[model samples]
Target chain A: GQAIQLVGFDGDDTLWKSEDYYRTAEADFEAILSGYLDLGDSRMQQHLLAVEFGYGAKGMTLSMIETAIELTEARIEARDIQRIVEIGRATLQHPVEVIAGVREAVAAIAADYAVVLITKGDLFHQEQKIEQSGLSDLFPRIEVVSEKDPQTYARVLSEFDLPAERFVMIGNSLRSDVEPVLAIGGWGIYTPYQDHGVAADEPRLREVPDPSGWPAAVRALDAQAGRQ
Target chain B: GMTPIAQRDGQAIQLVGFDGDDTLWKSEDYYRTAEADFEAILSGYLDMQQHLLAVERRNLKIFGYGAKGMTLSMIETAIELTEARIEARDIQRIVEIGRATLQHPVEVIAGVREAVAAIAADYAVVLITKGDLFHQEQKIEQSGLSDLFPRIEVVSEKDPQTYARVLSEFDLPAERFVMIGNSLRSDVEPVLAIGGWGIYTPYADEPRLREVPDPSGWPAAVRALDAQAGRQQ
Candidate 1:
């Protein structure tokens, strides 16, 4: 009876191809900047992430433009700046490709418990991804939050009227998804799409290799939760 | 004895909606300054303010609204206006303009805090802002007015359909909801069109909506609308 009642999912990378596309865009971004500055310029990525712009194509695009300008000392060509803008636009317009096994995995999990699509980014793009992912019906509630902190997770769980023990969050980032949920006594299934050989061995956390492993990983956590 | 509907059901305004950017805090002022700075950056080329606005208008569906969107539009405008010959440094200047705007202090307008709190005392106050989700959320957290709003909606678009959707989610009829904000197009017109009440708190400058000259008049204006509704009932 202590089984999980609600499931939360991360949109980008977890359900669909997102980070890789952005990485591709970043690669393009670097190529454009290479014309004016050393391609090895470490500050470009730092500036891109350092800029307080929140996550998404718009923010990244703006940051890219700013970083391009700052790192190039204003000597970067206007056409290169325009190309950076195009890279961002292309990123936004990139078709949503659902990760293999994710659609099936979501359908399998939703059949038993309430699933909420929890993603953080530009609302417009997030909404677009949800609709295009063809996974909208699988999620009864879709929340586009600004951050994925413990407070946000707690707020969401409270709204659902469920205790932290009854929820499990599935996502790629340990910081954004697993650690925060685990901090609040909830469960997390981390699928490291871009594994940097980092592993978390917490009891409430399970690291899956891909979406195909989620349903079982969730059930395993649910069983462990029931015993607790 | 049967009582009249108006007397039996006391309050007509069950929920009140507040807009963020210009309504509760200083937004347009920073934008204006950013635009001025942008114009100066392009002084070597030409006055591209109109061109920037045009670019933003066309890109609304893609970028939505916020400092980031504005910055992107500024970049595009600068590149196009200069025939792609604009120096990287000048473009960097434009980015700084946007970055500065994003970091602009969350200056609550005069009397807005007291006024909003007073209204919230009698009704459910929700902050409905349309902009970049992350930026708006950051602003809300920084505004120090977040506690006053029971619900905060950072939507990408503000239109009749969107307002109606919000009302439905609020589980209240449109007639019982009233939206207060700066833009008639974004706040007033949509709410009014959706059969809800609207309070126009103009920054620069309509129909079927109440106008509050300042935040001081908000409570009185809302009460006046409620009184009118009670009389109609």
Candidate 2:
């Protein structure tokens, strides 16, 4: 085990109630679209989740409208599709409410390590969300990326002129944050805010209530690295 | 040899549609850089730049367009080219390749602000663009011109039908509309052919943008404008 020098966090579900807002908005979108055609919310929700999981920041594009447009087959008016666009826009404007225990955890980590915000979404919206989350001051450097792939992580390491082993990534998605970082030989910790609508994380990361406990976890990793 | 013609009746023009990418902001230039970065990383698997280009074209059929599909296509291309030697780490790099395009700053071309500002005062300005819908929306929102457009349309195929649909939906007739953009084909001839006025606002010193395509459909109704094409006249 190596001591972590730079700690990174995912913005969406990792630190806050992001996906819930998007999911709720999407449900509203599906119900609204059902008015134009037969209900597609059930399948639409799954597909939107898959798209976001697969494509990350690029996932929520206008292509999401294709399902409704195709199901109705030109029956949908410009206003009909326009209404869905409005719904999508509304999701972007949702309040950036942080998860429990995460804020203090981020602040705790920042005290010891070089902390940064690494997340993906619309640049305008992501930056706003970070600021709106009221945690912008916690981390000195923030990266609002389109996708969090290995190369992006590597470049973040390279750009900061640091090593992969010295970095620890914390996030909600197994795909977006943990696996890729682990692939790069860095420590990856999955965080889930399942106190409500959210789910739990991997065993490599125990189901801790929040990242507020991670300061000790980080220190243990560092202490272990010291012996090696 | 299509050139600027006499201005159309300005008083009749009621709606102005702007092509968001090249005309209003620096778009394709960044995309080119992204593509170059893709070639740089993936070329180790297959060295030729054209190889990546051909791979993308092949993937375009399956992946379609936009950054998400592009990411998927890139991963497939890596898997295909590397033939199972590809690790998740390699994929992680390719995924970041997709990010480069999205995270690139929304650099608005010169005179775009003043032009839109001037036009917005008199006409109902709309942003009709073709690309990744996420990128377009982000660029517009970040470009500080979000409030300028009354309507925004992001479509895939930049054909005449796209043009017609956007106009008809907005209730703005083709005859009374003006399409301002960079491409002679996608932005100029299509709108012009539909009786809308077209203004070609070419980017300075941009390679491959100089040839204005065929003048066959570029009617007198469309006047390719000045070197500085922002003037409403």
Over 4 Å off, model 2:
A40-61, A194-207, B1-233
Candidate 2, B93-148: lDDT as tens digits? 65566767667788776556776776666566678876555667678987888877
What docking grade does candidate 2 earn? incorrect
TM-score of chain B of 1: 0.91
Docking level for model 1: acceptable
Give the Cα error of residue A155 in candidate 2, in Å.
0.7
For residues B1-233, could you state the per-residue lDDT of candidate 1 as single tens digits?
00111112588877889999899999999998998898898888864457777899888867777787788889899888889878888888888898899888888899999999888877778889888777777788898987886478878789888887777776777778789999989998889898888899898614348988899999888888877766765
Task: Give me the displacement of residue A102 in model 1, in angstroms.
Answer: 1.7
Q: For residues A158-215, what per-residue lDDT tens digits would candidate 2 score against the true structure?
A: 7576788788888877677877776676766666551221224432343344677677
Instruction: Find the number of clashing residue pairs for candidate 2.
Output: 4
lDDT against the true structure, per candidate, is 0.82, 0.63
Winner by lDDT: 1
lDDT of 1 at B81: 84
